[PDB]
Amino acid sequence: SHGLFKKLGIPGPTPLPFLGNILSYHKGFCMFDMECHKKYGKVWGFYDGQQPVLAITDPDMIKTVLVKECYSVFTNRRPFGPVGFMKSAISIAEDEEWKRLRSLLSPTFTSGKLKEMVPIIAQYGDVLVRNLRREAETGKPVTLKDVFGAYSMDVITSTSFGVNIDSLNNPQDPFVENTKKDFLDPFFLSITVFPFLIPILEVLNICVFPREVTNFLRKSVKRMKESRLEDVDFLQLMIDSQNKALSDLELVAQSIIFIFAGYETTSSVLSFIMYELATHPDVQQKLQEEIDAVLPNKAPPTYDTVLQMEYLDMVVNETLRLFPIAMRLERVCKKDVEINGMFIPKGVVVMIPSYALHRDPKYWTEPEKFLPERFSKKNKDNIDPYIYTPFGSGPRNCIGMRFALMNMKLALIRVLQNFSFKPCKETQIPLKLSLGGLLQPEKPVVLKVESRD
Amino acid sequence: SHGLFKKLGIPGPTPLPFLGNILSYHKGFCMFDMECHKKYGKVWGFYDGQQPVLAITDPDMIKTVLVKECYSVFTNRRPFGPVGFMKSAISIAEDEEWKRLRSLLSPTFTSGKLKEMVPIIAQYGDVLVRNLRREAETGKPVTLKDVFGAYSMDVITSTSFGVNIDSLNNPQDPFVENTKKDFLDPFFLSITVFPFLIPILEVLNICVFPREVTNFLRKSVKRMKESRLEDVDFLQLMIDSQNKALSDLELVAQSIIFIFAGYETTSSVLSFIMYELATHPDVQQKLQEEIDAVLPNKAPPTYDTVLQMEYLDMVVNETLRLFPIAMRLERVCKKDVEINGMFIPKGVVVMIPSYALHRDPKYWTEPEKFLPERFSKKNKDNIDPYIYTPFGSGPRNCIGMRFALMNMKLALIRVLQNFSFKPCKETQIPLKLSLGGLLQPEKPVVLKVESRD
Ligand code: HEM
Ligand code: HEM
Ligand SMILES: CC(C)(C)OC(=O)N[C@@H](CS[C@@H](Cc1ccccc1)C(=O)NCCCc1cccnc1)Cc1cccc2ccccc12
Ligand SMILES: CC(C)(C)OC(=O)N[C@@H](CS[C@@H](Cc1ccccc1)C(=O)NCCCc1cccnc1)Cc1cccc2ccccc12
Numbered sequence: 001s002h003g004l005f006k007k008l009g010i011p012g013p014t015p016l017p018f019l020g021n022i023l024s025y026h027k028g029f030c031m032f033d034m035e036c037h038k039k040y041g042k043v044w045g046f047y048d049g050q051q052p053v054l055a056i057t058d059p060d061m062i063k064t065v066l067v068k069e070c071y072s073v074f075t076n077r078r079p080f081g082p083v084g085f086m087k088s089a090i091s092i093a094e095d096e097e098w099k100r101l102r103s104l105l106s107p108t109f110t111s112g113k114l115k116e117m118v119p120i121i122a123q124y125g126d127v128l129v130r131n132l133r134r135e136a137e138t139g140k141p142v143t144l145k146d147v148f149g150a151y152s153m154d155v156i157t158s159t160s161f162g163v164n165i166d167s168l169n170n171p172q173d174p175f176v177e178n179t180k181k182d183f184l185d186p187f188f189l190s191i192t193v194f195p196f197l198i199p200i201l202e203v204l205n206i207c208v209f210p211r212e213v214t215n216f217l218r219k220s221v222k223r224m225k226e227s228r229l230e231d232v233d234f235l236q237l238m239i240d241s242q243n244k245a246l247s248d249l250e251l252v253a254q255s256i257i258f259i260f261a262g263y264e265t266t267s268s269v270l271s272f273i274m275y276e277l278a279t280h281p282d283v284q285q286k287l288q289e290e291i292d293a294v295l296p297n298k299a300p301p302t303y304d305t306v307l308q309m310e311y312l313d314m315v316v317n318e319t320l321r322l323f324p325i326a327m328r329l330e331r332v333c334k335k336d337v338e339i340n341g342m343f344i345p346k347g348v349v350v351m352i353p354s355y356a357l358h359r360d361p362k363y364w365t366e367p368e369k370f371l372p373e374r375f376s377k378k379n380k381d382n383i384d385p386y387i388y389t390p391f392g393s394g395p396r397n398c399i400g401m402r403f404a405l406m407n408m409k410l411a412l413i414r415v416l417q418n419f420s421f422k423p424c425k426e427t428q429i430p431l432k433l434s435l436g437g438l439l440q441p442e443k444p445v446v447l448k449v450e451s452r453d
Numbered sequence: 454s455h456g457l458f459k460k461l462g463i464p465g466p467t468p469l470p471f472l473g474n475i476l477s478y479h480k481g482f483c484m485f486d487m488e489c490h491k492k493y494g495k496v497w498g499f500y501d502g503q504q505p506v507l508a509i510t511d512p513d514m515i516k517t518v519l520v521k522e523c524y525s526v527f528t529n530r531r532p533f534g535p536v537g538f539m540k541s542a543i544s545i546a547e548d549e550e551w552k553r554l555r556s557l558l559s560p561t562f563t564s565g566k567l568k569e570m571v572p573i574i575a576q577y578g579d580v581l582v583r584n585l586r587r588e589a590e591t592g593k594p595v596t597l598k599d600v601f602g603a604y605s606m607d608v609i610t611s612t613s614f615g616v617n618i619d620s621l622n623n624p625q626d627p628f629v630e631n632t633k634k635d636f637l638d639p640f641f642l643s644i645t646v647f648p649f650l651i652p653i654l655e656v657l658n659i660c661v662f663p664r665e666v667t668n669f670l671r672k673s674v675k676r677m678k679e680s681r682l683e684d685v686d687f688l689q690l691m692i693d694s695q696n697k698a699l700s701d702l703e704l705v706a707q708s709i710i711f712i713f714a715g716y717e718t719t720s721s722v723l724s725f726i727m728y729e730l731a732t733h734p735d736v737q738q739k740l741q742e743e744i745d746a747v748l749p750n751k752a753p754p755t756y757d758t759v760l761q762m763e764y765l766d767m768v769v770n771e772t773l774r775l776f777p778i779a780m781r782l783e784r785v786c787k788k789d790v791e792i793n794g795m796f797i798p799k800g801v802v803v804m805i806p807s808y809a810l811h812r813d814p815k816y817w818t819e820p821e822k823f824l825p826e827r828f829s830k831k832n833k834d835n836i837d838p839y840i841y842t843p844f845g846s847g848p849r850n851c852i853g854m855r856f857a858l859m860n861m862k863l864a865l866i867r868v869l870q871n872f873s874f875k876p877c878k879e880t881q882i883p884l885k886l887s888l889g890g891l892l893q894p895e896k897p898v899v900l901k902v903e904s905r906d
Contacts, residue, residue, distance in 0.1 A: 050656070096788070195652070196649075196652035196653045196655075196656055199648070199649035199652060200649045202649075203503070203649055335549070
């Protein structure tokens, strides 16, 4: 299998037998993508075990894969097992089972439903404030991934099930635990070298999702379903949709995938944002000023005031450019095709190296720097929406994007209304990224929180 | 997985864990199909390991699967590994790779090409006669599977490569051996219980085709290709087609599958025919008379005289009804569908129990008896072409049917022109079928050959 890219005349590193190029992952997906872009140029290939991965960087080519030829050729992401019943999760389903779930859950993430979810997301920003203030009156450095992880979990439970917990002070509630539990850890590298073992593990009901987590949430949902039936969150929006319609095991899968999609992403991004704010105190100050110009007297943000804050949107987008937590985007080529002059054989995984593209000098001036002005209403027109893809692009992009941006912004407004964030001596400057398989700091971000009082 | 047919309300035997119903194969596919038709009626289900197989017997339903919904829903047969490069063999390829090979090789089996192949198939009938006459002048019972196996091989080599051998007297020629080498033998039952092992064996290049056979024929073809290039058989018909076009490894796969398709089928059917002729000497006598009425003075049969013999066609079809060497027909349901009022879930293998249908009293009077008159020009109109399916039906039926019928008939004319076949004391009467996984006699058919001289 290791003669395909050599046969198509596509450059790339030379693969060892069995392993492919996976030894190149010793410095992380992102460093390997960067080195590969620099070495081989616009298009290259490599092998995840025996799996040919063809990396592309042409905006027209990226556009054709993610948007134009989605329903026909590039419909699925690369397979993932063992998954068990999570096969029905939208992000894992394939072909016509996805296209059906994508429709049942699309009206769940409309602007109308999202503005309604704002008051509930607003109540736990206040919870975050009081909890941050307890840590601000003491004088001890704050770990963001904990205080934000507690907040991100607070929004999920309330916006997906109506379960109302202060998870930071209730870290030992049974509903809070099922969730805090890396494609370069020993198991998945083994899966990439021995993918012939996935069908073994699937017949043994061994699931990459912990079987106790999914067993707890499955019965926890069926309790909520028959307590409301009969006597604003995602579950209620999915129950109303099954009233082709959403099944009862399908509905529990999506609820899990919503948490598993929304938890460490929301938490880890606010951490990258607050890091950048504290190491560029000017940007934090201007953001604090725009916040107080729109919401004077520490006013509670609303849906419309959040869309009014332009410098806030710039800080978010610039952070996501720096740290695009997907790192990559991937589609499985289900048929032989020629797009933009390049023949792609069936079965190849086409990959768009997001992190690398977001840091390419040929598209960004001083790409390593934190310059929110790249996205000002003046310059935001010069950015190719296929070079900047933090939520991906096309019919299979992030279905929760609007919710994510609105969630993270409501947090930042309330937190910056009341506090200022200054680096510590133990704050890692410059921040270094984890050489693992997840986009995250090598050491958790720790900052000093002060009160505007 | 073992709750599907119970959920759809479809009757059938109860499956043990892991095994499914495979213990019911202890008396052969055919006895199990018969018992199942009698017990459960028109539609039933069972499990090959974990694989749901839904058996159908409604002619309209059979018609929809094999003909109407072929290109959309029921395009492939149930998977088969480990196969290696024989994935490209027409009978194994899937979806759009099959539909392309089916077209490249369809004009190879036209009536025009087949009438041209008749003189070459005629030369080795004479070889068979002299060889049978050597065994007729002695006085020793003749094993048909050897004398016919030698003949069937003779037609293949000459009609597929131009290789001209008297295989019966040259049993030790290297080209003759690569070919004489059961889905109920230990390996394939293991594959049916542990199908998660096929991807293991495929990455070990272990192939159900012997790797020495395919390595011999691969290089043997590339010798013929460049000796004709540049300086009437199947290879030449496939070389002219690649002049989307047929590849060089694709072309060797089909050549193998033509032998492997045409060898034990042609050989074993003539054996079933000569058995029935010898145990019904009246039918053999009438067939001998029709043969001599069309070809007087032991004339050499031609293409048109073969299509003129009506009682010969009746003997063939009635034998194939009795012994339909496919036993079953199978299609993999690639999408959820409802046909003829029955919902079929995606992935289920739909199976048509040919052998059972060919022996159903509700469609055949005295079905166990050898009555060639069922197919006379009077009664041949009352036979549902979906109840009688010796070559299957629809766009994925036997591509070599015309060649097979013409091949077996030319053999029978020449053999019956010169000899008469009478049972032995060691001839198994009534013939008993192998309880294994292939349709064949439990003991090889042995008959006494006499000369009309
Ligand atoms: C900062 C927050 C987030 C970022 C940066 C992000 C990014 C992404 C990206 C890049 C993709 C793949 C898009 C593609 O393949 O082109 C994706 C998919 C997805 N996201 Fe997110 N995401 C975020 C938050 C969320 C949230 C809060 C949810 C809540 C439900 C969510 C649900 C999903 C789902 C279901 C998919 C799979 C979509 C599909 O396969 O149809 N995401 N996200
Ligand atoms: C008495 C002789 C034969 C009988 C009874 C027979 C019967 C069958 C049957 C029942 C099928 C499956 C049809 C279906 O799925 O509906 C089949 C397929 C096939 N046969 Fe035969 N066959 C015979 C001889 C031959 C010969 C001589 C060849 C020579 C090339 C051949 C080539 C094929 C191929 C390639 C397929 C697969 C077709 C496809 O998948 O497109 N067969 N045969
Ligand atoms: C690794 C491999 C090459 C084999 O398969 C990919 O190609 N890797 C995608 C699968 S990881 C997986 C992680 C996970 C699974 C189940 C439950 C929770 C997490 C996954 O399916 N999560 C789906 C959506 C979760 C999500 C996370 C972040 C943002 N939004 C949604 C990685 C992947 C798939 C789909 C969307 C993604 C979005 C961002 C980052 C990775 C995403
Ligand atoms: C057993 C399983 C349920 C997993 O898979 C089926 O469903 N079993 C079909 C595969 S057996 C296989 C045997 C074979 C393979 C490779 C080389 C030679 C023989 C096969 O692929 N041979 C394809 C065509 C050969 C042929 C034989 C007889 C007549 N014409 C053609 C069985 C099967 C598939 C396709 C056509 C068949 C025709 C008659 C009988 C069986 C046929």
